Structures are given as structure tokens and as C-alpha cells.
Design a protein around this ligand. Sequence first.
Ligand code: NAG
Ligand code: NAG
Lengths: 250, 263
Amino acid sequence: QDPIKFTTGSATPASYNQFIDALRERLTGGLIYGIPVLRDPSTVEKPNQYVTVELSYSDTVSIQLGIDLTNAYVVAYRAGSESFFFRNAPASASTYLFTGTQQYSLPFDGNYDDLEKWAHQSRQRISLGLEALRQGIKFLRSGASDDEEIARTLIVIIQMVAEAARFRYVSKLVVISLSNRAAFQPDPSMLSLENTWEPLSRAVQHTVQDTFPQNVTLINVRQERVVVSSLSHPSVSALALMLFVCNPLN
Amino acid sequence: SKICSSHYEPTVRIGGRDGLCVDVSDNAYNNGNPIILWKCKDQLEVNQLWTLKSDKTIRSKGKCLTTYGYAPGNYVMIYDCSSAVAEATYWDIWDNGTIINPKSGLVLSAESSSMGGTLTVQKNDYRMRQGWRTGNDTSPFVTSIAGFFKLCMEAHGNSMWLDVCDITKEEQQWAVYPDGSIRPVQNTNNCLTCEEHKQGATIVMMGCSNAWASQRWVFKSDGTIYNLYDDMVMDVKSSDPSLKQIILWPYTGNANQMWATLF
Ligand SMILES: *[C@@H]1O[C@H](CO)[C@@H](O)[C@H](O)[C@H]1NC(C)=O
Ligand SMILES: *[C@H]1O[C@H](CO)[C@@H](O)[C@H](O)[C@H]1NC(C)=O
């Protein structure tokens, strides 16, 4: 009934996973070859293109994120009576999200190049974990007008919520982190998955004779090139949610 | 955003038993020359490259992968696609890693455990020796296998159980072969296999030379490690890590049945 929420104050491997599954379930438009797929963009009306998610720090401190149901991308966040949309956001985001708050534009887009650029730090150097997430929510709920820090914290949240929903690999890494009570940085395989979501989605959906039409290259911990070409390649299990590309039939 | 195009006919290698490749004997393309399993060569050679034709033929240098006949034991060969019986040239490559010939209902198999062996068609038993993976890159997929809560699969001699994930431990590196077998990086002769084809059997180490249906596994979209033949999945005994025991059990979907390839 109510919008998907994550109570960080009592987070556990179990509550976090419950949070992610609910977000995946909410984002699932259908299934292709047994893999959940985002709703077909030319099927959703603008008033139903966004969903909200809440991240709370305490019973009185929390923020909400705005997410496009079409690509699982975070387009904005709300803090108190204010809301902030990525410079890259289309007219419809503020039109249907955060109505009722003073809305503002961020000087940077929601992509990693821009976020990394404004954070003066690439993903590989930004730590992830429960203590980072909670530090981030508290920072966004306040108003410290620091763009460098906002981009950095948003990079933390995007991967712990958005990528986590897209990849079973990311959510898994976040859980070992909670269990470990130890921060961690994305290894080259985590970035490989983030940077390859779209083509992987295209590969799967174009599968014929259990084979992708064009190979998809992934990079592992040792930075070795793992060239995938099969829908039944073990690495494909790292995918929890696909971007919609085409319905198979003909 | 409409319909996917399926006119693409890719050319790739087909790996299988023990990471060997589907090879056309001595690059000989005379009608009847047997198809065997050979060491996947350093170079991408034509006699080990196949084109997934739209009409359902698997061609190499213009000829068709073909079964001599429709009976268990019949071997497969290279053969002119027009001169041959059409039914003997069609193949379905399923999502399970099974290459099946529609007309006979039999599946591509590598019965010999020695390189050079001829391929044949057999009653399908979802055995390691009947599992294949298309793709020029035919190497085994090395990676960690994470179970629930910060716990990873670790090899202990001829036993396997959970331990706190630690990327520095070689005993936690696994090699998933194109045939569906999960092998310990330190000894690719070992293969995780169920002790018995029954609910509750523990997963142990056994010589891969057997190539049983109990040594083949698929990493399913639902986060489980699944066995085709038994129709069950790897499961942490009563969700208790201390039991140092990973067993076979029917799908429940619980945390103790969720895994993730952490490569
Ligand atoms: C496999 O290798 C062959 C020859 O190098 C190439 O023509 C083919 O396209 C490759 N398969 C791919 C990239 O799907
Ligand atoms: C895989 O092959 C076909 C289609 O993919 C399916 O009918 C069969 O059940 C599958 N193998 C299994 C799950 O035993």
C-alpha cells in the first residue's frame, strides 16, 4: 500500500533484503527468459512514470528519493519541504514528483561522469556501507549547501538503492558489508556491471539459440576480460532487473 | 520498443566437458568426418567455430553439424547441408545448456573422458557431459560463490562448507566450467557433486572424470544453484552454518537458498 521505505536505524541483512525485493517488485513490468524487466516506456503515462522511496535515519529524520519507473534511475530527492532534481531531469519529474515542496535544480546530471566530476572522486574511491548511508541521509536532510558533498553522497545512495535493485551482485555486496560491519569500495567487476546494464539487457532480450547476437564484455576482480555470449552464462545470474528493450517473438 | 530482431546469425565456439571445444576432426571437412571434443586452441580457428543459422543448423566452414542417426550412440559429423537428411541437421540449444536434435529427441553428448573423443547423441540425462556453453571465450568462469550473511563457499579437501568471505583465500575461488561443473581452483579434477540423487544429500568433492548429472549446475535467475536432473537446489542445512554442510533440497526461496556469483 504505502511507498517503499528503508528504516536504517534498525537495518539488518534481512530488512535490507526485504527493502530491495519490494523495490524490485515495484519496478517489475514483466519477465523475459525468467528475468524481471522494467515496464515498457511506451506503456506508462507520465503521471505514473515515477515512484517514491523513503530512507529514514530516525523517527524524525529521513529523506525521499524520486525514481523513474522507466529506467530505475534516481531523478531527485526530498529533504523537508525542499526537493532537488538532477539538472538532467525532464519537465515531468518535478511536475509529478515532490508536488508541494519548493523544488530546485542541481547543477549536475544524474550520470556517474557528472556526479564523479562534482565529487572530485570516482566511484572506485567512494566507500559504501550502512554508516555511509546513514551519514548521507542526515547530510541530505540538513541543508549544508555543498554540491561536492551532495554529489558524493548521491553516488553512495544510487548504488545502494538503484544499482542494488538492478544487480543481485550489488545487494549481495551491501549485505556482506552489513554483516561485516565494515565499509567497502566497488571493485572493477561492480563497475563493470553498473557500466554494462543496458547492453546486458539488450543481449538477454535478443537471445536466440541461447546465444547473444553480439558479445557483452565484463571485467572481473583481477581486471580480466570475461567475454559473455550465452544467456546461460553464470555471470548472467548477477542481473536482478533488466532495462526494457524489446519483446521477443519474431 | 516493439519486437526483437532475430535475423542475427552469430559465429562462436561451443565449450563443454572439461572445458574442451566442439572440434571438426583434423580440420577435415569431408562428409562424414566425425565431430569430437578437442583442446580449445589459443587461436580462434575455423574448425572450432560454428554459426548459429536461423534455420536451426550449426555450421562450420559451410557444412552442418549432423547426427549419423536417431538412435542412442550414433555419432555426430560434419556434412553437406543439402546432401544430408534435413532432420539430422537441426538442433535446439536450450537455456539449460542442452543441445537437442528435435527429430530424435536425443542430445549432443561427449561420452569419452579423454580428449579426442567423438561426440554422439544420447537419451538426455542432464549430465555434465551433455552440458554446453556457446561463446568464443570458452574458459571456465572463475569467481566466488556467496551464500547468505557474509558467508562464502570454501573448499576443504574433498569437503565444502561456508566461511566468512575473504578475497585473499584461494580456497574460495571457483571455476564454473562451460559444462556446468563447479570446480575448486586449486584442483580442477574435483567437482561439487551430490552424494545421492535424493533430498537431503550433502554436496561433496568428487573426480570430475565421472561427469554425472550430479556434477552439473545452473545459476538460476532466482538466485539459486539448481540441478536439472534432481530438480533441487543447493541449500544450507537448516540455515545453520556451523553444520559445515551444504545439501540438496527442494526450492523454498529462503535466504539459506540464495547465492551470488561474486567475481
Ligand atoms: C568469434 O570469433 C570469430 C572469428 O574470430 C568472429 O568472426 C565471431 O564474430 C566471434 N563471435 C562473436 C564476437 O560473437
Ligand atoms: C530446459 O529446456 C526446455 C526449454 O528451455 C525446458 O522444457 C526444460 O524443462 C528445461 N530443462 C529443465 C528445467 O529440466
